[PDB]
Amino acid sequence: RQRIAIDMDEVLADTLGAVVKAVNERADLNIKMESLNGKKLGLVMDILKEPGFFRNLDVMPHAQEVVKQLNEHYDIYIATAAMDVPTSFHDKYEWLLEYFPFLDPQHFVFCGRKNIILADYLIDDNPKQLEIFEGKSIMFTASHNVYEHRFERVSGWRDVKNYFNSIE
């Protein structure tokens, strides 16, 4: 029975959509999502560090239904940065409890470098974690990584379900 580790930001949670929305509201801009392809987005840091920010994020389309399915055959762990935005440790945990209530809360791990994670698969948007992970790395598409080619790529949660269906 194999183990899949899943990153939170830009994979399970729509962290980028939330930041852009807040920036557009506050600084009165019209940043389009497309314009961030291959790129990374002061006010932003302050948006990310506001209490509740990680609590209020949207779930990525189809992520709940797909992860609930994968959980029938795979052990699921959720992995996320701790020292990135220290003050949001609790909000992230509470978001996972709200939106992924069917997962064992003991399977939530906070770490920097995900090479410490013992699992067969890692679903992550960050190439820097995909390159160091010691299982099979699966790259979840995000605007910043659209020009990366080294890793097996999945664009969305339906793509995730299809990948796992193909190796079973």
Min separation Cβ 20 and its own copies, Å? 27
Three-class SS state of 17: helix
Contact between residue 51 and residue 91 where contact means Cβ atoms under 8 Å apart:
yes
Among 4, 5, 130, 154, binds its own copies (CB under 8 A): 5
- 9 a catalytic residue: yes
Give the residues lining the site for Mg ion (CB under 5 A): 7, 9-10, 125
Binder among 116, 155, 158, 162 for its own copies (CB under 8 A): 116
Task: Identify whether 7 is a catalytic site residue.
Answer: yes
Query: Which region, left, alpha or beta, applies to residue 143 given φ > 0 means left and ψ of -120 to 50 means alpha?
Result: alpha
Tokens of 144: 């910043």
Quote the tokens at residue 164. 């796992």
- Of positions 21, 23, 50, 89, contacts its own copies by CB under 8 A: 89
Beta carbons of 1 and 75 less than 8 angstroms apart: yes
Amino acid at 109: V
Residues near its own copies (CB under 8 A), total: 25
Residues making contact with its own copies (CB under 8 A):
3, 5, 77, 82-83, 86, 89-90, 93, 104-113, 115-119, 134
Positions marked active-site? 7, 9
